[PDB]
Design a protein around this ligand. Sequence first.
Ligand SMILES: OC[C@H]1O[C@@H](O[C@H]2[C@@H](OC[C@H]3O[C@@H](O[C@H]4[C@H](O)[C@@H](O)[C@@H](O)O[C@@H]4CO)[C@H](O)[C@@H](O)[C@@H]3O[C@@H]3O[C@H](CO[C@H]4OC[C@@H](O)[C@H](O)[C@H]4O)[C@@H](O[C@@H]4O[C@H](CO[C@H]5OC[C@@H](O)[C@H](O)[C@H]5O)[C@@H](O)[C@H](O)[C@H]4O)[C@H](O)[C@H]3O)OC[C@@H](O)[C@@H]2O)[C@H](O)[C@@H](O)[C@H]1O
Ligand SMILES: OC[C@H]1O[C@@H](O)[C@H](O)[C@@H](O)[C@@H]1O[C@@H]1O[C@H](CO[C@H]2OC[C@@H](O)[C@H](O)[C@H]2O)[C@@H](O[C@@H]2O[C@H](CO[C@H]3OC[C@@H](O)[C@H](O)[C@H]3O)[C@@H](O[C@@H]3O[C@H](CO[C@H]4OC[C@@H](O)[C@H](O)[C@H]4O)[C@@H](O)[C@H](O)[C@H]3O)[C@H](O)[C@H]2O)[C@H](O)[C@H]1O
Ligand SMILES: [Cl-]
Ligand SMILES: [Cl-]
Ligand SMILES: [Cl-]
Ligand SMILES: [Cl-]
Ligand SMILES: [Cl-]
Ligand SMILES: [Cl-]
Ligand SMILES: [Cl-]
Ligand SMILES: [Cl-]
Ligand SMILES: [Cl-]
Ligand SMILES: [Cl-]
Ligand SMILES: [Cl-]
Ligand SMILES: [Cl-]
Ligand SMILES: [Cl-]
Ligand SMILES: [Cl-]
Ligand SMILES: [Cl-]
Ligand SMILES: [Cl-]
Ligand SMILES: [Cl-]
Ligand SMILES: [Cl-]
Ligand SMILES: [Cl-]
Ligand SMILES: [Cl-]
Ligand SMILES: [Cl-]
Ligand SMILES: [Cl-]
Ligand SMILES: [Cl-]
Ligand SMILES: [Cl-]
Ligand SMILES: [Cl-]
Ligand SMILES: [Cl-]
Ligand SMILES: [Cl-]
Length: 685
Amino acid sequence: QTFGNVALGGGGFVSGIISHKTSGDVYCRTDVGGAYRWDAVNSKWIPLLDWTSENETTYQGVEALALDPQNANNLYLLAGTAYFNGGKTAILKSTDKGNTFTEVIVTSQFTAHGNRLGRANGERLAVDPNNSSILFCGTGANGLWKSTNGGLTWTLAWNGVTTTSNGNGICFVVFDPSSVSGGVTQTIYIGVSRTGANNIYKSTDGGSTFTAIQPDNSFMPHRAVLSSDNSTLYVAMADGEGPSNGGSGRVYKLVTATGTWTNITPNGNNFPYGGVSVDPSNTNRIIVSTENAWSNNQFGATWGDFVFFSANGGNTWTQKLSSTSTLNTNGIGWIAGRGIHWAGSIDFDPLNTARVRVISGNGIFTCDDINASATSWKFDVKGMEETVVLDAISIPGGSFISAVGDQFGAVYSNVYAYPAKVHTPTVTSNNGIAYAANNVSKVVRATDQLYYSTDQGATWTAAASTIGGGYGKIALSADGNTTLYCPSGQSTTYYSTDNGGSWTSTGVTTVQDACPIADYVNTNKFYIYSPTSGQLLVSTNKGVSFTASAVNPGQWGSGRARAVPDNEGSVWVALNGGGLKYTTNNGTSWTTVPNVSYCGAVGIGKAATGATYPAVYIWGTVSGVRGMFRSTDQGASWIRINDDAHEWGGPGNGNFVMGDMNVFGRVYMSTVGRGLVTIESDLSA
Ligand SMILES: OC[C@H]1O[C@@H](O[C@H]2[C@@H](OC[C@H]3O[C@@H](O[C@H]4[C@H](O)[C@@H](O)[C@@H](O)O[C@@H]4CO)[C@H](O)[C@@H](O)[C@@H]3O[C@@H]3O[C@H](CO[C@H]4OC[C@@H](O)[C@H](O)[C@H]4O)[C@@H](O[C@@H]4O[C@H](CO[C@H]5OC[C@@H](O)[C@H](O)[C@H]5O)[C@@H](O)[C@H](O)[C@H]4O)[C@H](O)[C@H]3O)OC[C@@H](O)[C@@H]2O)[C@H](O)[C@@H](O)[C@H]1O
Ligand SMILES: OC[C@H]1O[C@@H](O)[C@H](O)[C@@H](O)[C@@H]1O[C@@H]1O[C@H](CO[C@H]2OC[C@@H](O)[C@H](O)[C@H]2O)[C@@H](O[C@@H]2O[C@H](CO[C@H]3OC[C@@H](O)[C@H](O)[C@H]3O)[C@@H](O[C@@H]3O[C@H](CO[C@H]4OC[C@@H](O)[C@H](O)[C@H]4O)[C@@H](O)[C@H](O)[C@H]3O)[C@H](O)[C@H]2O)[C@H](O)[C@H]1O
Ligand SMILES: [Cl-]
Ligand SMILES: [Cl-]
Ligand SMILES: [Cl-]
Ligand SMILES: [Cl-]
Ligand SMILES: [Cl-]
Ligand SMILES: [Cl-]
Ligand SMILES: [Cl-]
Ligand SMILES: [Cl-]
Ligand SMILES: [Cl-]
Ligand SMILES: [Cl-]
Ligand SMILES: [Cl-]
Ligand SMILES: [Cl-]
Ligand SMILES: [Cl-]
Ligand SMILES: [Cl-]
Ligand SMILES: [Cl-]
Ligand SMILES: [Cl-]
Ligand SMILES: [Cl-]
Ligand SMILES: [Cl-]
Ligand SMILES: [Cl-]
Ligand SMILES: [Cl-]
Ligand SMILES: [Cl-]
Ligand SMILES: [Cl-]
Ligand SMILES: [Cl-]
Ligand SMILES: [Cl-]
Ligand SMILES: [Cl-]
Ligand SMILES: [Cl-]
Ligand SMILES: [Cl-]
């Protein structure tokens, strides 16, 4: 209720599906946005890692997820991202299906990178099916590790493999619990993400020594699974690790009693393969998915990977995703024309193996009846949001409009309703958006080119020219007639009085990735805060020229400063470790907000009833507590409106907080991998 998301649905890469082969619990992991449990009672995904603080953004990268065959309550994640928090890596252990976790930091022993090449391979973390206290973990670069205390500490088990050219190392670990001594499983199979050297190994002494067994080192394994009866190991492989490389591949099966490998590649098509699943009650019933194939014209509407099913252990196969399939959008209209790609994990639902889930670069798709002649695949992403949101606007009396990486963004009359369409044309992303305060039908967005709308985002027309380059931040004057624009990666802000028919430099040439801001009241006034110089630059001639204000707010803040409705000359600046300041006089002087020792982002929203100033929202540290705070009294007092369970890793790539201008208390925040989060902070009930 209080915490949620703008509805979009999936929109990023789910890198693995893991189900409990006895209880039927289903989970997934993602590369940039944590992990989820499928709540089959309520039919929605439940995020499990929204508690990660900004000191734990790293854990949004989930490299492996393991369940305990003997106890469905246990759940383990290997979490870490190379580029956050020093690459800090942990085993995250839960005894309650992910409702709560214990953190076991392992960085100095081994690291993980959820956004690595090879990330859909797995699972490289596994629980001994005979002994809940024993886990093994293959690592990308540090060998094979084990724990004998349920994941609390780890030791090096085997180092015959450590590093590989692709950085992905040991990429699956599978136990055969038919082989046991002293209550410790003795047979372990591992896969290694390399070609031209040994890459599938078997130990029969509990992981102390391994023997190479692969039939063809031209291909590296992605995933493997052992049938419930322990008789047959199925392996998907390709000549690259995926998800976005690999040009050919195979499916193999190993009959363990005789060590017999059979090439069961569907139709000898030799596509790159990643996903494989076996029915827990039928060794011979299997399904596979290609990974990084693109020549399947799914639904007749899109291009992506293939899915093949067999009931005879791979002797013959039937396609289960093709041009005759249909896409059930499940009320999420914008997914039409998109499909299943990077399909490096596929899973029969253990409770009913007529049902199959498959991953994709844009979410997860579910076929509830794999036996149908013309299969129906549902975009099955309720509760899941994985996009990287880059900008947004909230129009008083109008729509909320997002600018999103990969899935472009949408126009919302109800932010909790799934969009029928996303902004088109877009190339890759929209990274900036603006509207005219006194001409609210006029909106502009920045992709490879600028696009203008005269109907509040419903339709778009390209600017005649987009000066400098695309993807920059943008402002529209209050009257809508002037645009200011700084191309991404460039340091000059330009102005146009004709929707980009012509451009002229503002004279501001030294603010890289400038975020120009229009005053809401005075159509001739704009501001640019420069982190490098520490200056607030102000224009009173509609962008023709700027001057620095009398007093600098200070250096090294966020470029995303905010003007204030109904308050000409007011600007709030998030100063990072310099705190939070605001001016009411165009930067002639500044108020230091007491008790704010750090502020990463500031946004404005609808005023409280009976208040005289718009509400202010920050992501920052107030009296020593980092989180989301609201002030309804112009910064004199603050209240925390998030909680320790809802931090999401902080503001992430888009680095913004913004209030809704129509719904008091509602605030939006960007994230590294959880879409656009919302807090409905008006707790009046
Ligand atoms: O090229 C395609 C290829 O990419 C591989 O992945 C690697 C690649 O990732 C790019 C971005 O991935 C994107 O996620 C995708 C995801 O992969 C998809 O599967 C799917 O789910 O969609 C998402 C979204 O599209 C991430 O969103 C994106 O963040 C990744 O880009 C990296 O971002 C890091 C974090 O920073 C950004 O977010 C926090 C903000 O505060 C930052 O402003 C913003 O940059 C970047 O790291 C940051 O880098 C700066 C500067 O670093 C530089 O200067 C100092 C030197 O010491 C550094 O070495 C030097 O790089 C740091 O100051 C900062 O501390 C750090 O956090 C990062 O540079 C940027 O690339 O690229 C990074 C690899 O790690 C990924 O493996 C895929 O594997 C592959 O399949 C294919 O897609
Ligand atoms: O014509 C049909 C088909 O015929 C085959 O025979 C041919 O080989 C195919 O190329 C062709 O299909 C088209 O394939 C490309 C990929 O092509 C590359 O790989 C195969 C090579 O043969 C070829 O030479 C290569 O050029 C597909 O492109 C991929 O599309 C997906 C999905 O894109 C959709 O969703 C995002 C939206 O922005 C797009 O408009 C929409 O189409 C992309 O996946 C998303 O990627 C981003 C991360 O981006 C980055 O990593 C990969 C890199 O290529 C890209 O440039 C980077 O930006 C993630 O955040 C998303 O989560 C993920 O879903 C791929 O990035 C992209 O390569 C064509 O769609 C397909 O029609
Ligand atoms: Cl269900
Ligand atoms: Cl299991
Ligand atoms: Cl159980
Ligand atoms: Cl046990
Ligand atoms: Cl103990
Ligand atoms: Cl070593
Ligand atoms: Cl190698
Ligand atoms: Cl050995
Ligand atoms: Cl079986
Ligand atoms: Cl064997
Ligand atoms: Cl065949
Ligand atoms: Cl085929
Ligand atoms: Cl292909
Ligand atoms: Cl077929
Ligand atoms: Cl697609
Ligand atoms: Cl709304
Ligand atoms: Cl659309
Ligand atoms: Cl208006
Ligand atoms: Cl126009
Ligand atoms: Cl005006
Ligand atoms: Cl700057
Ligand atoms: Cl300064
Ligand atoms: Cl003024
Ligand atoms: Cl704002
Ligand atoms: Cl709390
Ligand atoms: Cl937390
Ligand atoms: Cl309240």
